[PDB]
């Protein structure tokens, strides 16, 4: 019997896992990456998904779709959709009060529902798993934010059905993270678990109370617009100014130069989580001028200080809403690729007065890890 898979369908990245050989296995893609961008590109000759899609975003911005999760299960007139649209390079249209992303594909103008774009991302995650398993996958557990309403959950489930998956269950992301650390097995009474999730585009704080396998969301807080994207932007602004000092030229109006710089900034940012410095070398960034420079971890922290600190207020709010004090929290769980930033970990630990942070499972893989566990449980 084929194994069921656990899929973390994130706003910016997705992750797939499977419980086999008595353990959870986070599956790497064709490029050897354990997480895949939630991107879909349409060109004159093909449809690109994942790495291939995000990799050519600078070349084809109007037809490279991302952030489908922000549109999924929402109406076109929804204030959130109306606001989000203003920031995207791709077109969003109204189809019976339902948003649809409109792009050019093979010379023709096509429009797709958010669930259709997400089904493409899910199909890629499903194939990533099938390539590893050696056989076709039919069952899966897909995760969603705790705040997702009935429409958003239905649309997410529909995205899975379109991808050819029997959605065993749609479970909350913070709950999946808890399951990953075995916190669902809570012996002798209630335990409060705080999930600190800082991803690529959103920041979520969830406080759960686990009473013998039964979860209850005590409080949620955060910022749906705060994420790694913001830290990359801080680095972009910094280097744009540095290019001005060193070349007396402003590249801010050249969309391709800014996008390429952003890409290099995200890469340098990731390196800074493991090293105290990172070199940034871009070939022909602007008018044949190469941009070979570097940046220290301290400099990066200074550029993002306010944003890092801002993550503590939602923690304070959540504790206040759950009517609990710091000491009443039994476990702190890190989720999201951005929690890999040392400064972010320091702020949370210091706020919790030296408490241990559950971070043994790669933060950007914890939700998929928990989904894989749950999928296995549901399969028996
Ligand atoms: N080592 C790292 N250091 C800092 N940020 C990282 C690191 N690895 C990944 N990230 C960032 O994590 C974010 C994506 O988080 P992830 O949890 O994988 O996706 P999502 O938020 O969409 O669920 C991106 O902003 C990415 O650059
Ligand atoms: Ca996420
Ligand atoms: Ca932002
Ligand atoms: Na993710
Ligand atoms: Na998040």
Swiss-Prot record:
Disulfide bridge map: none
Subcellular location: Cytoplasm; Nucleus; Cytoplasm, Cytoskeleton, Microtubule organizing center, Centrosome; Secreted
Transferase is among the record's keywords: no
GO biological process terms on file: ATP metabolic process; cellular heat acclimation; cellular response to heat; cellular response to oxidative stress; cellular response to steroid hormone stimulus; cellular response to unfolded protein; chaperone cofactor-dependent protein refolding; chaperone-mediated protein complex assembly
Chief location: cytoplasm
Resulting phenotype, residue 75 to Q: No loss of acetylation and ATPase activity. Exhibits normal protein refolding activity during the early phase but exhibits defects in ubiquitin-mediated protein degradation during the later phase
Residue numbers carrying N6-acetyllysine: 75, 106, 244, 346
Keywords from the UniProt entry: Acetylation, ATP-binding, Chaperone, Cytoplasm, Cytoskeleton, Host cell receptor for virus entry, Host-virus interaction, Methylation, Nucleotide-binding, Nucleus, Phosphoprotein, Receptor, Secreted, Stress response
CC annotations in GO: aggresome; blood microparticle; centriole; centrosome; cytoplasm; cytosol; endoplasmic reticulum; extracellular exosome
Function in brief: Molecular chaperone implicated in a wide variety of cellular processes, including protection of the proteome from stress, folding and transport of newly synthesized polypeptides, activation of proteolysis of misfolded proteins and the formation and dissociation of protein complexes. Plays a pivotal role in the protein quality control system, ensuring the correct folding of proteins, the re-folding of misfolded proteins and controlling the targeting of proteins for subsequent degradation. This is achieved through cycles of ATP binding, ATP hydrolysis and ADP release, mediated by co-chaperones. (Microbial infection) In case of rotavirus A infection, serves as a post-attachment receptor for the virus to facilitate entry into the cell.
Family named by the database record: Belongs to the heat shock protein 70 family.
Subunit-structure text: Component of the CatSper complex. Identified in a IGF2BP1-dependent mRNP granule complex containing untranslated mRNAs. Interacts with CHCHD3, DNAJC7, IRAK1BP1, PPP5C and TSC2. Interacts with TERT; the interaction occurs in the absence of the RNA component, TERC, and dissociates once the TERT complex has formed. Interacts with TRIM5 (via B30.2/SPRY domain). Interacts with METTL21A. Interacts with DNAAF2. Interacts with PRKN. Interacts with FOXP3. Interacts with NOD2; the interaction enhances NOD2 stability. Interacts with DNAJC9 (via J domain).
Entry's disease: In certain aggressive cases of activated B cell-like diffuse large B-cell lymphoma (ABC-DLBCL), plays a role in the cytoplasmic sequestration of misfolded N-terminal mutated PRDM1 proteins, promotes their association with SYNV1/HRD1 and degradation through the SYNV1-proteasome pathway. HSPA1A inhibition restores PRDM1 nuclear localization and transcriptional activity in lymphoma cell lines and suppresses growth in xenografts.
Domain-related comment: The N-terminal nucleotide binding domain (NBD) (also known as the ATPase domain) is responsible for binding and hydrolyzing ATP. The C-terminal substrate-binding domain (SBD) (also known as peptide-binding domain) binds to the client/substrate proteins. The two domains are allosterically coupled so that, when ATP is bound to the NBD, the SBD binds relatively weakly to clients. When ADP is bound in the NBD, a conformational change enhances the affinity of the SBD for client proteins.
Protein name as catalogued: Heat shock 70 kDa protein 1A
Source species taxonomy: Eukaryota, Metazoa, Chordata, Craniata, Vertebrata
């Amino acid at each position: 019997k084929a194994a069921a898979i656990g899929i973390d369908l994130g706003t910016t990245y997705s992750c797939i896992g499977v419980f086999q050989h008595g353990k959870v296995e986070i599956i790497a893609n064709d490029q050897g990456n354990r997480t895949t961008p939630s991107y879909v590109a349409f060109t004159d000759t093909e449809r690109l998904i994942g790495d291939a899609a995000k990799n050519q975003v600078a070349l084809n911005p109007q037809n490279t779709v991302f952030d489908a999760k922000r549109l999924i299960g929402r109406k076109f007139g929804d204030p959130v959709v109306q606001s989000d649209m203003k920031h995207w390079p791709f077109q969003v249209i109204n189809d019976g009060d339902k948003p649809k992303v409109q792009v050019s594909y093979k010379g023709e103008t096509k429009a797709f529902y958010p669930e259709e774009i997400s089904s493409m991302v899910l199909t890629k995650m499903k194939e990533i798993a099938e390539a590893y398993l050696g056989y076709p996958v039919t069952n899966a557990v897909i995760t969603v934010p705790a705040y997702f309403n009935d429409s958003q959950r239905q649309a997410t489930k529909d995205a899975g059905v379109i991808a050819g998956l029997n959605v065993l269950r749609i479970i909350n992301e913070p709950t999946a993270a808890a399951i990953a650390y075995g916190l669902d097995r809570t012996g002798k009474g209630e335990r409060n678990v705080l999930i600190f999730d800082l991803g690529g585009g959103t920041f979520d704080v969830s406080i759960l109370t686990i009473d013998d396998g039964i979860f209850e969301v005590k409080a949620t807080a955060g910022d749906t617009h705060l994420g790694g994207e913001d830290f990359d932007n801080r680095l972009v602004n910094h280097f744009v100014e540095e290019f001005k000092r060193k070349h007396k030229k402003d590249i801010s109006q050249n969309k391709r130069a800014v996008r390429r710089l952003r890409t290099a900034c995200e890469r340098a940012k990731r390196t800074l989580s493991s090293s105290t410095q990172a070199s940034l070398e871009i070939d022909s960034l602007f008018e044949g001028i190469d941009f070979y420079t570097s940046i220290t971890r301290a400099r990066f922290e200074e550029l993002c200080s306010d944003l890092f600190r801002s993550t503590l207020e939602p923690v304070e709010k959540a504790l206040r809403d759950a009517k609990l004090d710091k000491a009443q929290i039994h476990d702190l769980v890190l989720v999201g690729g951005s929690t890999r930033i040392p400064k972010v970990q320091k702020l949370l630990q210091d706020f919790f007065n030296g408490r241990d942070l559950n971070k043994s499972i790669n933060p950007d893989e914890a939700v998929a890890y928990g989904a894989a566990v749950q999928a296995a449980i549901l399969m028996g």
